[PDB]
Amino acid sequence: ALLSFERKYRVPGGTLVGGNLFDFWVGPFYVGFFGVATFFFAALGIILIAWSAVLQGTWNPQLISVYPPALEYGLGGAPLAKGGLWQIITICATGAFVSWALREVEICRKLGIGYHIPFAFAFAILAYLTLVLFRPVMMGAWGYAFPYGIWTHLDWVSNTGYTYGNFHYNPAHMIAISFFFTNALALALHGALVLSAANPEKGKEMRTPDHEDTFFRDLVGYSIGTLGIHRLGLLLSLSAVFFSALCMIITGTIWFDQWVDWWQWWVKLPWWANIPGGING
Amino acid sequence: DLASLAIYSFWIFLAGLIYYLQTENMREGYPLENEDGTPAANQGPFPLPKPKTFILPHGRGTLTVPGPESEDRPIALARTAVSEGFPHAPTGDPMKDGVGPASWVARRDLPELDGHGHNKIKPMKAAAGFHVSAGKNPIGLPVRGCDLEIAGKVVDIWVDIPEQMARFLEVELKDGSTRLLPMQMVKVQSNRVHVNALSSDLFAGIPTIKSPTEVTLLEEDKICGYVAGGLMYAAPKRKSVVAAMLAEYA
Amino acid sequence: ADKSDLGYTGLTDEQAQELHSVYMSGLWLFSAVAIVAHLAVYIWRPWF
Amino acid sequence: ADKSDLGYTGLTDEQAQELHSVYMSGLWLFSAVAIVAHLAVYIWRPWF
Amino acid sequence: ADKSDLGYTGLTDEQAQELHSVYMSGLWLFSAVAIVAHLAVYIWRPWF
Amino acid sequence: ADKSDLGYTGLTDEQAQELHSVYMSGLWLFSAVAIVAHLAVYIWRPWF
Amino acid sequence: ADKSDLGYTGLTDEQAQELHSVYMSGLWLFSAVAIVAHLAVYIWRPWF
Amino acid sequence: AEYQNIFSQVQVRGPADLGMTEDVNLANRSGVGPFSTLLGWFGNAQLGPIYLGSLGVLSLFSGLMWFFTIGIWFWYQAGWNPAVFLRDLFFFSLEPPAPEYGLSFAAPLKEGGLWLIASFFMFVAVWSWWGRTYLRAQALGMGKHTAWAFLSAIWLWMVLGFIRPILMGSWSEAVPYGIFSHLDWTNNFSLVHGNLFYNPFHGLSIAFLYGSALLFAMHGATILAVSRFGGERELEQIADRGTAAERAALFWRWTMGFNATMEGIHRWAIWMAVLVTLTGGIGILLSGTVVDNWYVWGQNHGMA
Amino acid sequence: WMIFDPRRVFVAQGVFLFLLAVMIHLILLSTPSYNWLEISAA
Amino acid sequence: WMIFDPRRVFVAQGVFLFLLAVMIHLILLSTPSYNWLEISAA
Amino acid sequence: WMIFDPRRVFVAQGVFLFLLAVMIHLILLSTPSYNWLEISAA
Amino acid sequence: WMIFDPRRVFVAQGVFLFLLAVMIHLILLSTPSYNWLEISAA
Amino acid sequence: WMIFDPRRVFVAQGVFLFLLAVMIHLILLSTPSYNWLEISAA
Amino acid sequence: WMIFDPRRVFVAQGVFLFLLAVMIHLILLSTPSYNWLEISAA
Amino acid sequence: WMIFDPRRVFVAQGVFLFLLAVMIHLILLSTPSYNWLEISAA
Numbered sequence A: 001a002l003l004s005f006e007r008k009y010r011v012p013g014g015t016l017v018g019g020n021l022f023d024f025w026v027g028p029f030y031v032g033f034f035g036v037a038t039f040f041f042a043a044l045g046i047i048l049i050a051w052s053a054v055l056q057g058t059w060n061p062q063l064i065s066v067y068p069p070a071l072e073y074g075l076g077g078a079p080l081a082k083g084g085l086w087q088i089i090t091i092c093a094t095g096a097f098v099s100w101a102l103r104e105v106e107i108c109r110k111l112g113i114g115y116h117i118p119f120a121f122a123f124a125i126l127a128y129l130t131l132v133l134f135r136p137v138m139m140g141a142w143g144y145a146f147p148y149g150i151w152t153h154l155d156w157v158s159n160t161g162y163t164y165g166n167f168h169y170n171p172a173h174m175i176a177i178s179f180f181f182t183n184a185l186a187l188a189l190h191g192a193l194v195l196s197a198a199n200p201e202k203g204k205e206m207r208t209p210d211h212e213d214t215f216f217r218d219l220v221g222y223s224i225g226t227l228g229i230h231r232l233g234l235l236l237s238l239s240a241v242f243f244s245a246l247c248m249i250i251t252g253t254i255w256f257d258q259w260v261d262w263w264q265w266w267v268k269l270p271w272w273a274n275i276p277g278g279i280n281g
Numbered sequence B: 001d002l003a004s005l006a007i008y009s010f011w012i013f014l015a016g017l018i019y020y021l022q023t024e025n026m027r028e029g030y031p032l033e034n035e036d037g038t039p040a041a042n043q044g045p046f047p048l049p050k051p052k053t054f055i056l057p058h059g060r061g062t063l064t065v066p067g068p069e070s071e072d073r074p075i076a077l078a079r080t081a082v083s084e085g086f087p088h089a090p091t092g093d094p095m096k097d098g099v100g101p102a103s104w105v106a107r108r109d110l111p112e113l114d115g116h117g118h119n120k121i122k123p124m125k126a127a128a129g130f131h132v133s134a135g136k137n138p139i140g141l142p143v144r145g146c147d148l149e150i151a152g153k154v155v156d157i158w159v160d161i162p163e164q165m166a167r168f169l170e171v172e173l174k175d176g177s178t179r180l181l182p183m184q185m186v187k188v189q190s191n192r193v194h195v196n197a198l199s200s201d202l203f204a205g206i207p208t209i210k211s212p213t214e215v216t217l218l219e220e221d222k223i224c225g226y227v228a229g230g231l232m233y234a235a236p237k238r239k240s241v242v243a244a245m246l247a248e249y250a
Numbered sequence C, D, E, F, G: 001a002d003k004s005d006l007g008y009t010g011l012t013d014e015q016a017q018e019l020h021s022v023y024m025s026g027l028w029l030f031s032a033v034a035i036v037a038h039l040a041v042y043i044w045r046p047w048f
Numbered sequence H: 001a002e003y004q005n006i007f008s009q010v011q012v013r014g015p016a017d018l019g020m021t022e023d024v025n026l027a028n029r030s031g032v033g034p035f036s037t038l039l040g041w042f043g044n045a046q047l048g049p050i051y052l053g054s055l056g057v058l059s060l061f062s063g064l065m066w067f068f069t070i071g072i073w074f075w076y077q078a079g080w081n082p083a084v085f086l087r088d089l090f091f092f093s094l095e096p097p098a099p100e101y102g103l104s105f106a107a108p109l110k111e112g113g114l115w116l117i118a119s120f121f122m123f124v125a126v127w128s129w130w131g132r133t134y135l136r137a138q139a140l141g142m143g144k145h146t147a148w149a150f151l152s153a154i155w156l157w158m159v160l161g162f163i164r165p166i167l168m169g170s171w172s173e174a175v176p177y178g179i180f181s182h183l184d185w186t187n188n189f190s191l192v193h194g195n196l197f198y199n200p201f202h203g204l205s206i207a208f209l210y211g212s213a214l215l216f217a218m219h220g221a222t223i224l225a226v227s228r229f230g231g232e233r234e235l236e237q238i239a240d241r242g243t244a245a246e247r248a249a250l251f252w253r254w255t256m257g258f259n260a261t262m263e264g265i266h267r268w269a270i271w272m273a274v275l276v277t278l279t280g281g282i283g284i285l286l287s288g289t290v291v292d293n294w295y296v297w298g299q300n301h302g303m304a
Numbered sequence I, J, K, L, M, N, O: 001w002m003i004f005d006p007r008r009v010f011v012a013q014g015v016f017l018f019l020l021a022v023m024i025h026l027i028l029l030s031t032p033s034y035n036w037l038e039i040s041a042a
C-alpha cells in the first residue's frame, strides 16, 4: 500500500555498495538493507522474553528476568539466565537500535531530507549504552547492570536506588532534570502553536506568523520565531541524557558512596570555613 | 473513591485515543492511491475522516483539507514493475522529467501573504531596511558547485522580518536569467563558498523565478527540491566523486 | 508501459497467468494439505 | 523500453528455465533434504 | 451575499419554525421520559 | 458593514429581539427550577 | 473603523450613555439587593 | 556602526515592527525593546513588546511576595551575614503549619509562619498567569488550547497543597519551601506510601513524561530536517500541503509505520501534554484518599 | 470591546454551573448530615 | 483612555464576584459549632 | 494618557479592595485577643 | 480486482501464517499434559 | 473510498477474528470449572 | 512471472531460512532440561 | 551472478560465521555448571 502522492517518490537505490538487492517495500514499511536486518533482530528478540521464562521462573513479562552477570567473574561470561543468556540479548537490542537509525539513511540518501535523524536516536544509542557497556567493564565484571523487565528493573531503581543517599544531590542528574521538565515545557505551547487559527473558535479567518508575534510576545517576553522552538524541541529531548550519562559515568564507578555526602564540598571554603551558620549552625 | 474503579474510565476513554488521534493525523495524504491513479488497497484501521471547513489566512477560498489529491501535475516514471511494490525509473535523465529525488507541485497563483498587505520573501533590493555603510562588507562573493568548480556569484540577500531570517541566496549569472537555491545545505568557511549538492554545470536547469522579487507558492516546490534531486543519484560511479560525496562529517 | 485509472494494476493477463498461478500455492499447501498434517494430530492427542 | 503482454520481465522462454530451475528446485534441494535429515532429527531426542 | 448580523443565519423567523417547534416541543422527550426513570429512583432506595 | 457605536452589532433588530424575548422566558427559570431543588433539600433532611 | 489615539472606541459622548444608563441603574442593585442581604449577617449571628 | 553579512546562515535584522492589532491594547506596551544583535544569525533577535497589563503583573507581584516570603525565611538562620546566605542558599529551609495544626491560620512567624504568605500571593500569580496564556490568544483571534495544557498542568497544583490538605486537614500535607527542602519531600511521598511503583497513576504520569521526549527528539529534528525545502514555516504547510509534508510524511510511515498531518503533529504533541500532570493530578488525588501504601495496592490490584 | 462574549456563553458558561456544582456535590454528598441517597436506614 | 468598556461588562459582573466569594465563603463553615445548616438539627 | 482612566479605577480598583484588604484579613481572624467571633462559651 | 502479489507472495505473505503458526507451536509445549514430545524422561 | 476491500482479508482480517478469539480464550480456558484441555485424566 | 530470478531468488532463501531455522534453534535451546548439552546439568 | 560473490560472501560471510561464533560464546562458555578454566580457586 502507498499514498496518493507516493507516486513520484518511488525510486531504487539509497543503499550503498552492492546494488538494490535489499530495498523491497513490504507494505507501509521500509525493508532496505537494514530492513531485513531488523527483521532478523525483531524475530529473535520476542523469544528473549520467553527464554528465562523457564529458567528464572514465570512466563509472564511481569516478572520475567534474564539477570546481568555477577560483579567479579571478570572480563568474560557468566552463568546463563543470570548473565550468559543476558549477554546475548544486548547485541540484538543494540544490533537492532543500529539497524534502524541507519536504515533511515537508505531513505535519506534515497530522497534528500536531512541527516539530523540518524542522530536523535543516537542520544538514545548513547543513553541505553551507558547502562550496558559504559559501566560494568571496569569496576569488576558485567554485574553492574539493570534487568530488562518491566517490573523487575522497577524494584531495582528505588528501594535499590539509595546507594548514593539521595540522587537529587546529584547535580548533573538534577541539571539533566533542569533539562527534562523543560521538554514538555516547550511541547505544550508548540504542540499548541499550530492548532487554533483555522480552528480559532469557529469561522474566523486564519492567523499568520504576525499573530504568533502578538500572542507569544504577548506571553513570556521571548519570541525566537517558529524555527526557534524546533530549536526548542530538539533542545529538551536529547540532552537530559548526556547530563544523566554524565550523572553516572562518575557515579558508582568513582562514587559508589553517598551523593548526599557531596553537598559538604560546598560548605568548605576558607572564608566561611570554621563557621556554622544556619540550619548547619 | 475506591481501590478499583478509576483505571476503567481510562482503559476505555483512552483505549481509543491512538484511534481518534491517528485519523486526525491521517487527514492529508489519504486516501491511499495506487501507482497510477487508482482507489488503492485501502486506508487502514484508522481510516481518513471527512474533512471540516477550513478558513484561509488571506481569503484563498474554500480549500478543504484533505483537498486536491488527484493527478494534476506531470509525473514521468517508466513503470518497471507493473506489480505494486518494485520501484520505477524515469525516462531519459531523471533531472528533466522531474521524478525520484526532485519533487514539486502545482498550486494556485497567489503567493504566501502575511498581514501587512504585502508578500513574504523579498531581496535586499526590495527592502531598504538594512544596508552597508561601515568598514568593508561582504555581500558579493564567488561560489563553487559539487563538481568542485566555480558556479557563479552571489551579491544579495532575500530578507525576512517576522522571523528576521533568510531563505534564498540569489546568483548573478553572466546574463541575468533568474535562478534559485536553498539555505540550510550551505557550508561556507572563508572567502569562497562550497555547495556539495549540484555540479556547476547544472544550475541553469533551476527555474528562473518568474519574478526576481516574488516567490509564488507554486514556484516554491522545485526551487527547493532540485538540490534534493542531486542527493540521491549523485554520483555514479568512480574516482573524484567517491572522495567528495562520501566520507565528510557535518 | 504506464497506467492511469481503476483498477489497474492489475491487470490481464498479468493477473491471469500470474496471480492465479501463485496464490493457490499459498491457499492449498496450507488449506487441504494442512489437513494432511491433521493426520498425526486429530488422534494424537485430544483423546488420552 | 518496457513492453506490453504477459508478462515482463521476463522472459520467454523463462517460465520453465528461470521460474522452475531456481524456483521449483527449492521444492527439492531442501524439501526432500529435510525428509532425509529428519531421520537423524525426529528421534533426537523426543524420546527419553 | 453574506448575511447581516447575529445570528443570520438565522434567520427570521427560521428560528421560530425549525428551531422553536421541535427544539422546545420535541425536546420535551428530554423532560417527560426522564421522570419515568426518575420516579423509580427518587427514594428507592434512599429509603429501605 | 462596520457600525460606529454599541451595540451594533448589536443589532437592535437582533439585540432586544434576540436577548430579551427569552429573558422572562430565559432568566426566569434558572432562578426558579434551582429553588425547586432547594425547597426540597432545606427540610429533608438537615433537621435531626 | 478607528479614528486615532486616546481614545477610540470609545466614546464621546456615548460613554455616559453606556456607563451610566445601565452601569449606574442596574449596577446599583449591586448595592440595593446585596445590602438587603447584608441584613441577615450584620447582627445574625455575630451578636446572638 | 553597521550590521555585517557573514558566511552561511543567513540573517537580516528588523527595524520597527510588532505584530497584529484587534482586541489587544495600544498605550500599554512599553518602548521598542533594545535588540540583542550579538551573533543573532541562528534564531531571532528582538526584545519586546509585552502586554504589561493587570492580567500579567498580578503575577509579577504575587510571584514576588511568593519570592520574598520564603526569602525572609532564607536569611533567618544564617547569622545575619552575606557569607552564610549564598553559602546555604539551599541548605536553608521552611515548612508549613505542623502535621498537627492544619485548618487554623493562628500560627505566628516562627515555627511555621512564612508559608502562609508566599502561596497566598502565588495563588493569584499562577492563577493570574493561567490567564496570560488563555486570553492573549483572544486579543487576536486564535484559540484557548495554550492554557488548556495549563489547566491540566495546574491539575497537579490542584492536589499537592490545595484539595487534599483541606478535606483531610493539615498543612504539612503541603509542600515545604526551599531548594532542597522539597527534595527531601519528593522521596517522602515515595516511602511513606509504600513506594509508588505499584501506583500506575503516579507511574503513568511518568509514562506521560517519557512521551515528551519520544515526541520532541524528532520534531526538533525533522522540522529542522525538512527546512531546506519549506517545513520551517508551520503557518503554510497544512491546508496548502507543501513538499515538507512529502519529505516528512513519507519519511516516518516507511520507518515506524505511520505518518501524520501537518496539523495532527500538534494533536499528539498536546495529547502527551494535557495528560502528564493531569494523570498526575488524579494519580496524586488517588494517593491519600484511596490506598496509601501502594505496595499494599499493586499486589491486590496487580498480582491478586 | 476588549475581551469576548460569544465564547463565554456556550462554553465558559460551564465554569459557573457545572465545575461549580460537580465539585461541591461530592462535598455535600459525603456529608452524613444530609445523605438523601445515603439515608436508606441509619 | 487606554481601554474599552462594553464587553468585559458581563465577566466583571457574572463571575468576578465569586472569585472573592469562593475564597471567603469557606473560612466560616469549618467550625463544628457554627454551620447554621448542620446545627439546626439535633 | 497612560494612567488608565476608565480602567484602573473600574477594574484595578475593584480588585485592590481584594489586594489590600484580604491579605490582612486572614491573620486577625483567628487571633484570640480580638476574637469577636471566636469567644464561644468561654 | 486490484491487489498485488509478485512482491507480496515471496517475502510478505509468508510471514502471515508464519505469524499464525509458529506463534502457537510454542504454547502446545508449555502445557504439562499436551506437550506431545516434552515429557519423555518421566 | 471510506471502505475498500482487497487487502484487509489477507493480512488483517485473518488476525481480526483471531484477535477477537484470543482475548476470549485465556479466561474460559482458565475458569473455575471449564478449561477443557489440560484435564482429561482424572 | 515478474518477481526476481537473477536478484531475489537465491537470497530470499539464504537469510530467510536463517531467519526461520538458526533462530528457531534458540527455542529448542530454551530448555535447560532437554538440550543436547544440558542433559547432564539436570 | 546469481549470488554476489565479492559482496554477500567475502566480508558478509566472514561475519556470517562471526554470526554464530560469539553469541554461543555466551552460552557454552557460560552455563552454570561447566567453566573448566574459571574455577581454578574453588
Ligand code: BCL
Pocket (backbone or CB within 6 Å): A097, A123, A124, A125, A127, A128, A130, A156, A157, A158, A161, A162, A166, A167, A168, A172, A173, A174, A176, A177, A180, A181, A240, A241, A243, A244, A245, A247, A248
Ligand atoms: C532513587 C530515585 C532517584 C532516581 C533514580 C534513578 C536511576 C537508577 C537512574 C536514574 C536516571 C536518570 N534520572 Mg533519576 N531518579 C530520581 C527521579 C528522577 C526524576 C523525577 C522528576 O522524579 C527525573 C526527572 C529523573 C531523571 C533522571 C535523568 C537524569 C536520568 C535518566 C537517564 C535516561 O533515562 O536516559 C537513557 C535513555 C534511554 C534508556 C532511551 C534509549 C532508547 C533506546 C535506544 C530504544 C529502546 C527501544 C525499546 C527497547 C523498544 C520499546 C518500544 C516497543 C517497540 C513498543 N530522575 C530520584 C531522584 N534515576 C538514570 C541515569 O542517570 O543513568 C543514565 C538511572 O539509571
Ligand code: BCL
Pocket (backbone or CB within 6 Å): A158, H059, H063, H125, H126, H129, H153, H154, H156, H157, H185, H186, H187, H188, H189, H190, H191, H195, H196, H197, H201, H202, H203, H205, H206, H207, H209, H277, H279, H280, H281, H283, H284
Ligand atoms: C521512589 C521513586 C519513584 C518516584 C517518586 C515520586 C513522587 C513522590 C512523585 C513523583 C511524581 C512524578 N514523578 Mg516519579 N518516581 C519514580 C520515577 C520517576 C522518573 C524516572 C526515574 O524515570 C521520573 C523522570 C519521575 C518524575 C515524575 C513525574 C512524571 C511525576 C510528577 C510530574 C511533575 O514533576 O510535575 C510537577 C509540575 C507541577 C506541579 C506544575 C508546575 C506549574 C506551576 C503550577 C506553575 C507555577 C507558576 C509560577 C508563578 C511560575 C513562575 C515562573 C517565573 C516566570 C520564573 N519519576 C520512582 C518510581 N515521583 C510526582 C507526582 O505527582 O506523581 C504522579 C510525585 O509526587
Ligand code: BCL
Pocket (backbone or CB within 6 Å): A045, A046, A049, A061, A127, A128, A131, A146, A148, A149, A150, A153, A157, H203, H204, H206, H207, H210, H211, H214
Ligand atoms: C532509566 C531508569 C530505569 C527505568 C525508568 C522507568 C520509569 C519511571 C518508567 C519506565 C517505563 C518503561 N521503561 Mg524503563 N527504566 C529503565 C530501563 C529502560 C530501558 C533500557 C533497556 O535502557 C528502556 C528501553 C526502557 C523503557 C521502558 C518501557 C519498557 C516502559 C514504558 C516506557 C514509556 O511508557 O515511555 C515511552 C516509551 C514507549 C512508548 C515505548 C514502549 C515501551 C514498551 C512498554 C516496552 C516494549 C516491550 C514489549 C512488552 C515486548 C514486546 C515484544 C514482543 C512483541 C512480544 N526502560 C531503567 C532501569 N522506565 C514506564 C513504565 O512504567 O512502563 C509501563 C515508566 O514509568
Ligand SMILES: CC[C@H]1c2cc3[nH]c4c(c3C)C(=O)[C@H](C(=O)OC)c4c3nc(cc4[nH]c(cc(n2)[C@@H]1C)c(C(C)=O)c4C)[C@@H](C)[C@@H]3CCC(=O)OC/C=C(\C)CCC[C@H](C)CCC[C@H](C)CCCC(C)C
Pocket (backbone or CB within 6 Å): A038, A039, A041, A042, A043, A044, A045, A046, A048, A089, A092, A093, A096, A097, A100, A101, A120, A121, A123, A124, A127, A148, A149, A150, A237, A238, A239, A241, H210, H213, H214, H217, H218, H256
Ligand atoms: C534522548 C533520546 C530520547 C529518545 C529519542 C528517540 N527514540 C526514538 C527515536 C528517537 C529520535 C526514533 O526515531 C525511534 C522511533 O521509532 O520513534 C519513536 C525511537 C524509538 N524509541 C523507542 C523506545 C524508547 N525510546 C526511549 C527514550 C528516548 N528516545 C530518549 C528519551 C524509551 C525510554 C522510555 O527510555 C523507550 C522505551 C522505540 C519505540 C523506537 C525505536 C525503534 C527501533 O529502533 O526498533 C528496533 C528494535 C527492534 C528491531 C526489536 C529487536 C530488539 C530485540 C528483539 C528485543 C530487545 C530487548 C530489550 C530489552 C527490549 C526491552 C524493552 C523494554 C522492556 C525495556
Ligand SMILES: CC[C@H]1c2cc3[nH]c4c(c3C)C(=O)[C@H](C(=O)OC)c4c3nc(cc4[nH]c(cc(n2)[C@@H]1C)c(C(C)=O)c4C)[C@@H](C)[C@@H]3CCC(=O)OC/C=C(\C)CCC[C@H](C)CCC[C@H](C)CCCC(C)C
Pocket (backbone or CB within 6 Å): A181, A182, A183, A184, A185, A186, A188, A189, A219, A220, H059, H060, H061, H062, H063, H064, H067, H125, H126, H129, H130, H133, H146, H147, H148, H149, H150, H151, H152, H153, H272, H273, H274, H275, H276, H277
Ligand atoms: C503538560 C505538563 C508540562 C507543562 C505545561 C505548561 N507549563 C506552562 C504552561 C503549560 C501549558 C503555560 O501555559 C505556562 C507558560 O506560560 O509557559 C511559558 C507554563 C509555565 N511553566 C513554567 C515552568 C514549569 N514547567 C513545568 C513542567 C511542565 N509544564 C510539564 C513539562 C514545571 C514543573 C515540572 O513543575 C515548572 C515549574 C513557567 C516557564 C511557565 C509559568 C508562567 C508563570 O506562571 O509565571 C508567572 C510570572 C511570574 C511569577 C513573574 C514573577 C517572577 C518571579 C517570581 C519574581 C522574581 C523575578 C523578578 C524580575 C524580580 C526582579 C525585579 C524586577 C521588577 C526588576
Ligand SMILES: COC(C)(C)C/C=C/C(C)=C/C=C/C(C)=C/C=C/C(C)=C\C=C\C=C(C)\C=C\C=C(/C)CC/C=C(\C)CCC=C(C)C
Pocket (backbone or CB within 6 Å): H067, H068, H070, H071, H072, H074, H116, H119, H120, H123, H157, H158, H160, H161, H162, H174, H175, H176, H177, H178, H179, H182, J023
Ligand atoms: C537576594 O535574595 C532576595 C533578597 C532577592 C530574596 C530571595 C528569595 C528567595 C531565596 C527566593 C527563592 C525562591 C525559590 C527558588 C523557590 C522555589 C520553589 C520551589 C522549588 C518549589 C515550589 C513549589 C510551589 C509550592 C510547593 C506551592 C504550593 C502551594 C499550593 C499548591 C497551593 C497553596 C494555596 C494556599 C496556601 C491557600 C491560599 C489560598 C486561599 C484562597 C487561602
Ligand SMILES: [Fe+2]
Pocket (backbone or CB within 6 Å): A190, A191, A193, A194, H234, H266
Ligand atoms: Fe510545532
